[PDB]
């Protein structure tokens, strides 16, 4: 997270930290719990073994609130397009249901086809890098303003307002960044977006998956 502040420990109990195995190294992503047995994240976070940490604040410390669960099954959206990063959404079925408590609890999803007006202030949280030189051991968060679709249509030729959200005022040093992919965009305590992509510079606007465009798939996949 660029330009944010440390979260109050365990104030965002739906947040998940993902460790992903790849053929020549590893990746790190965020995610968020949507049911006791399912985490939502970005499809570009897929890999060949995924571990989910829930209940964390400092991910580099051994906290007794942490729950470490392997993903049983990783279900990318069938129309995910790696080239344009379209339909960038994935469900992780957890190998075991969480112990629900004050530190681990699911976040609410939007209603089917629910919109999100330009100008709305939202929050994003994650464990990603905070600049080009430093990261964070602890969960951080920043408030971002939803942009008019016009802004991302001009910057990103593959942007689609029907399935994505344009987020972040270019004039502020505030953004989601590397390692925050898959984390939620929260607007009035509902997860409307998934961190997807932006510029290597970290300069907004950035593109989020629009969760409400995928609710039928989410519901079918969890059933």
């Amino acid at each position: 997270i660029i330009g944010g502040r440390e979260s109050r420990p365990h104030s965002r109990p739906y947040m998940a930290y993902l460790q992903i195995q790849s053929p020549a190294g590893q990746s790190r992503c965020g995610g968020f719990l949507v049911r006791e047995d399912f985490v939502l994240t970005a499809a570009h976070c897929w890999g060949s073994n995924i571990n989910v940490t829930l209940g964390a604040h400092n991910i580099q410390r051994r906290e007794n609130t942490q729950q470490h669960i392997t993903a049983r099954r990783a279900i990318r959206h069938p129309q995910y397009n790696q080239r344009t990063i379209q339909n960038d959404i994935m469900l992780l079925q957890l190998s075991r249901r969480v112990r629900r408590n004050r530190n681990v609890n699911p976040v609410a999803l939007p209603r089917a086809q629910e919109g999100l007006r330009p100008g709305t202030l939202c929050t994003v949280a994650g464990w990603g890098r905070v600049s080009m030189r430093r990261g964070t051991d602890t969960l951080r968060e920043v408030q971002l303003r939803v942009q008019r679709d016009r802004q991302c249509l001009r910057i990103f030729g593959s942007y689609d307002p029907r399935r994505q959200i344009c987020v972040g005022d270019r004039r502020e040093r505030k953004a989601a960044f590397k390692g925050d992919s898959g984390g939620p965009l929260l607007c009035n305590n509902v997860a409307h977006g998934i961190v997807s992509y932006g510029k290597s510079s970290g300069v907004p606007p950035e593109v989020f998956t629009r969760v409400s465009s995928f609710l039928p798939w989410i519901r079918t996949t969890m059933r």
């Binding site: 190294g25 570009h44 976070c45 990063i85 590397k178 992919s181 898959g182 997807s196 932006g198 510029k199």
Partner: protein, 96 residues
């Protein structure tokens, strides 16, 4: 093991995961070229044709001592030279 963060930008888009390579030994630049092209393919669907026709297709190594090396993915005249990956701090990959 030696961990090397890298970033992929294709057509002006960077996915916002955090990715690292893990190295154990010395390697030729051509082996790093292969790792880079393999990730371009598996993360962003980049083909050999896309690379070869692109306005720019490069990766830049930043070494721990601050030196930077720009490698052309279309034709790397240094493919057969070696590097100790433990000297590599991070890799920036850019196509288009």
């Amino acid at each position: 093991k030696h961990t090397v963060p890298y970033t992929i930008s294709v057509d002006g888009i960077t996915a916002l995961h955090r990715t690292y390579f893990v190295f154990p030994k010395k390697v030729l630049y051509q082996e790093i070229d292969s790792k880079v092209k393999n990730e371009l393919a598996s993360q962003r669907g980049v083909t050999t044709e896309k690379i070869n026709n692109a306005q720019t297709a490069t990766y830049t190594l930043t070494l721990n001592d601050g030196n930077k090396k720009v490698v052309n993915l279309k034709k790397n005249d240094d493919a057969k030279n070696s590097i100790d990956p433990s000297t590599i701090k991070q890799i920036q990959i850019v196509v288009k």
